Design a protein around this ligand. Structure first.
Ligand SMILES: [Ca+2]
Ligand SMILES: [Ca+2]
Ligand SMILES: [Ca+2]
Ligand SMILES: [Ca+2]
Ligand SMILES: [Ca+2]
Ligand SMILES: [Ca+2]
Ligand SMILES: [Ca+2]
Ligand SMILES: [Ca+2]
Ligand SMILES: [Ca+2]
Ligand SMILES: [Ca+2]
Lengths: 659, 659
């Protein structure tokens, strides 16, 4: 017994009421007394506990006492029951009223009770099973000691016959769908039927009706069916009561990820309703509430174990395919090929998790691209997208512009899932920026606390053009890799001094041959030197943001030589392939083949990169995606996306800061 | 020195840079080395601290040393300055490079520095004065130990010549306006001018531009003027630098209260910008940020000291005016009269507070009412309103439907400012509810954590028809007063038994006389008894919510007799005036005169109410607003609104729960 409820005795009459377990009644006996009545006595049944409360002081009374008390407005009853009524129950309290002359009652008022248990239960303690009436089920708190139930957006697709994600409709087809859903049990105990005038109703708000759906599983003659009882255009469901000790099992799906204007928290209610009369609304005698938080979309840094390597290229790029295959064979990853840069630009593999279930889910980049990537939608492979209404899409909406750091600690605050990284332009610049709809979505997931970098000095404008992360083998540490033009100039000047100035660039690319690009020709180009000094300033501005926002020092960073050429917008495009954008499969790195100056018949860029990485136990494989095209103009011709295992750290164990 | 910044030496050249105090530089000397260089040495000036960092291990170096170190990419410099450059400064670091043959330098690279202090300061520690560089000025935290700067919505009006609140424009006229504003100081130290290519810029986001305005005070020849430098349609302002130790004083106004979609937090930034070249955006070398939270609109419970009593009635309601005047004379309050129920329905007196300033502010009820209450707008008397776009206004939007509890503790959680109370209908009812725009606004203030009650069983539909709060004189406690029909029936039945059944109701109201309403006539009306039993159920449902949400027991509640009659919508209107809606001026209560049955030439309702309240030290005055109309049909003919002192508890010392 916790909540006090008001049930008044009625003058001269009998009051019948449902008593919901976990509450108790305060009972006015004074208003029902006939005028002139002096004192009262009371009788009560075996399973009803009665106290007489005078001015706050309470006294327990026997089932049949003859004891009398003075009638006063400040003398009331407190009525309690610990167990549900059966058909063998008579649960009652009877009050007798006496005037001052004579010991025979002049009147009587009584209270007839039917006790029932009503509890809407969910797995609040997050172990995957639904506990009985968790007192914390009506709130949601973060952290290891945190509590409250978790809900997955059911964004995958169980059967291929439908083009759309499961959550797009109000229907369930396969029982396998239920495995993606959170269980909710309405537990009751009581007699064979509810007393006349009562019904039990499940309901949700209009606002939450596009955030959830709730199904009930029926097992009629011709086989299992799934009834949608709450969700889009269904705000309430009248429950069919069955007596004795009973449980109704419901399955809940999320329809929507957290977003701008939506915290991710939703509510479901059950009420016992009392019929008053026609034209009068039913009265909510008792209400129980459970809360769900919808699980966030979470990205995967390069430090996490690789599962599948997705690759796209034209069918004839052979060296690329052979070299990627060899790379993947060194690992336990599976290779998937589509016959070309989209897989990098249009998709980001994320994941969702709840205590009972989790699956990978694809974020699909905004269309400019007239069509979705939706052919990856399948069983336990989910899909989500955001499209702008007004705002126009630019190159910064491509997911080459979307990355995530490993876990970091910054100013004493840990980010166990790392931090999302997105390239942007300076605030006063008037430059490009990723669309608000996508930015709002990433921020709304909250657990990856996104950081904006400066990518808009690049023609394409993506963060993965200038930076990446790699593990340090045999440790729990990692390194930030940064593109560096000054590293390239230093190396080339060294090679020139060594007598190598005539060493030629892009050997084996026949479409570059007539250009005859040598170290000498590069170093003597004055405007190019100035362009790249400026680009190093851009890289260093990013370096400072990353050290600041990721809690990094110079010990955590390695510089890879890079070179750019300025276009007419004053933005950088790669002069030779960017080696920093690499396939990271734990200790094995697929690195884009640079095609740098040959010294003693080895690329000096390759040899320099090996000398930096190999002492760490990182094994380097250079991958050639460009020879099939016979030249390099600054554009990458293939794409790869690695799908990884989720973090072992549970997101709900994080404690993000107030918003 | 806290933040590390990257400044690279440039090959063969000299690099000039501004050094902002509170940062330090990491300096690459390796990239600037000529090819073939083996070792390096360095010189530096008196006010520049230089460390040689090899692989993380740092060593301080003398101003002129001859010491040489091996050139390595992992050997860098750490450069620090503790004081701003003057005109007498030469701040520099020079690096000499040596090859393996000979001790004369083969080249030199150098760093020329100008150190400046730049700090954007606000009163983060909330004492009313602007401290120097509070490290917490860039966040906002709740509570006694909390920190970060507070901003008032400047919603009052300094001069009458303009019809609108001060914040509606971009202009400031009177210097008195500045007193409503938060101070923000840009503090700097440095030489006579910034080095070539730099400028300092204040800025805000597009989003915050309708939330704030920022003025600078100039004192030219012809007198003081106020320049709007940031706000609506001004997102940035280029600052005029003056050398030496300088401070620029700015004044910040809030334009908007917290609301749906607006947390109340805003940002203002200062950046040092570096010019690169034409067509290239300027680079933000350094940025400092301050945060403001806009103060919430807060209501006043009846326990707070009364300041002014606002009253509206027709000019000839004399008994009302005389009796209200007498009541107010017992107190130190001032009476204000307008010559009629609006003042209760259309306005709610709230207040705002910041450490430097606070003033009362009126919430104006949504129009159905074709015109605002805006004639209360004046100096230090502010105004705010919310109007629906789509949703239609009903009687539940009237501010008789808007109240606030005294401070309460509920389940261990304290609500030091009390909790806002608003009447509504049951969730499945399809009944009336206050408009979303107003509800969203009240919820968004956060510090009064609003609760919805059930008012929609009443024809008018206001919470102040059935409940109120009064202090308990000579204590810190209070009572909830509840209308009770059962209390009325009990009293009338007692009077009937006493021989008083023929005692007549509404004596002295000539328009009621032909009805000849007596106790007998009331008690024998069967359908009326049933109507009022139902209304008591409605009252008791509210009673339970209040005890639950306010942490109240039966000891905290007193029932006042009331009676209603049902209309054709099954809603209640007062049968005789509702005594619970009363003027509370501390120990003195103006109570609506009930016009109840006369027994021994005293109203039995008046005598019953005195017997309940007077033993507590509450002094009762019955006020007659209806005799001037000769009858009572259930409508109240006058209105009163009491403006009170604010709580002494500062809202920013509260810690509300996560949202
Ligand atoms: Ca559980
Ligand atoms: Ca479905
Ligand atoms: Ca599914
Ligand atoms: Ca599934
Ligand atoms: Ca990506
Ligand atoms: Ca201060
Ligand atoms: Ca103004
Ligand atoms: Ca003002
Ligand atoms: Ca003012
Ligand atoms: Ca009010």
């Amino acid at each position: 017994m916790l909540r006090e409820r008001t049930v008044r005795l009625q003058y001269g009459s009998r009051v019948e009421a449902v008593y919901v377990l976990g509450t108790y009644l305060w009972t006015d006996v004074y208003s029902a007394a006939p005028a002139g009545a002096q004192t009262f006595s009371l009788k009560h049944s075996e399973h009803v506990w009665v106290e007489v409360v005078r001015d706050g002081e309470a006294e327990e009374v026997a089932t049949n006492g003859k004891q009398r008390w003075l009638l006063s407005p400040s003398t009331t009853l407190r009525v309690t029951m610990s167990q549900a009524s059966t058909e063998a129950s008579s649960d009652k309290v009877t009050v007798n009223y006496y005037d001052e002359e004579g010991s025979i009652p002049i009147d009587q008022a009584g209270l007839f009770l039917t006790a029932i248990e009503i509890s809407l239960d969910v797995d609040a303690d997050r172990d995957g099973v639904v506990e009985k009436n968790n007192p914390k089920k009506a709130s949601w708190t973060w952290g290891p000691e945190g509590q409250g139930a978790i809900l997955l957006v059911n964004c995958d697709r169980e059967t291929p016959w439908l083009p759309k994600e499961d959550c797009r409709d109000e229907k369930v087809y396969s029982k396998e769908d239920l495995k993606d859903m959170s269980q909710m049990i309405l537990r009751t105990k009581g007699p064979d039927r509810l007393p006349a005038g009562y019904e039990i109703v499940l309901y949700i708000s209009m606002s939450d009706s596009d955030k959830v759906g709730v199904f009930y599983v029926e097992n009629p003659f011709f086989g299992q069916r799934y009834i949608h009882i709450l969700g889009r255009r269904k705000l309430y469901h009248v429950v069919k009561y069955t007596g004795g000790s009973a449980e109704l099992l419901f399955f809940v799906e999320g329809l929507c990820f957290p977003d701008e204007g939506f915290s991710g928290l939703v509510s479901i209610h059950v009420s016992l309703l009392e019929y008053m009369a026609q034209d009068i609304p039913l009265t909510p005698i008792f209400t129980d509430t459970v809360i769900f938080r919808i699980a966030p979309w979470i990205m995967t840094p390069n430090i996490l174990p690789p599962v599948s390597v997705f690759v796209c290229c034209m069918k004839d790029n052979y060296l690329f395919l052979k070299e990627v295959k060899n790379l993947v064979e060194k690992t336990n990853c599976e290779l998937k090929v589509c016959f070309d840069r989209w897989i990098a630009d249009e998709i980001e593999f994320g994941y969702i998790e709840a205590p009972h279930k989790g699956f990978p889910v694809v974020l699909d980049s905004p269309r400019d691209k007239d069509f979705p990537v939706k052919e990856l939608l399948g069983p336990d492979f989910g899909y989500v997208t955001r499209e702008p209404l007004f705002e126009s899409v630019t190159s910064l909406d491509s997911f080459g512009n979307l990355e995530v750091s490993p876990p970091v600690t910054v100013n004493g605050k840990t980010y166990p899932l790392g931090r999302i990284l997105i390239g942007s332009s300076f605030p006063l610049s008037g430059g490009r920026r990723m669309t608000k709809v996508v930015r709002d979505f990433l921020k709304a997931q909250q657990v990856q606390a996104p950081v904006e970098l400066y990518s808009d000095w690049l023609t394409v404008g993506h963060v993965d053009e200038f930076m990446s992360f790699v593990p340090i083998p045999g440790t729990k540490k990692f390194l930030l890799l940064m593109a560096s033009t000054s590293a390239c100039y230093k190396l080339f000047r060294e090679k020139q001094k060594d007598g190598h100035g005539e060493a030629i660039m892009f050997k084996g690319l026949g479409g570059m041959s007539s250009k005859r690009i040598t170290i000498n020709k590069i170093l003597s180009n004055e405007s190019l030197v100035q362009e790249n000094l400026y680009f190093q300033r851009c890289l260093d501005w990013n370096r400072d943001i990353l050290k600041k926002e990721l809690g990094l020092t110079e010990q955590d960073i390695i510089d890879l030589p890079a070179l750019f050429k300025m276009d007419e917008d004053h933005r950088a495009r790669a002069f030779f392939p960017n080696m920093v954008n690499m396939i990271v499969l734990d200790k094995d790195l697929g690195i884009p083949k640079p095609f740098g100056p040959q010294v003693e018949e080895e690329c000096c860029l390759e040899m320099h990169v090996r000398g930096l990485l190999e002492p760490l136990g990182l094994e380097c494989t250079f991958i050639d995606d460009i020879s099939a095209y016979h030249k390099f103009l600054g554009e990458v011709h293939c794409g790869t996306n690695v799908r990884r295992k989720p973090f072992t750290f549970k997101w709900w164990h994080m404690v993000p800061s107030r918003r």
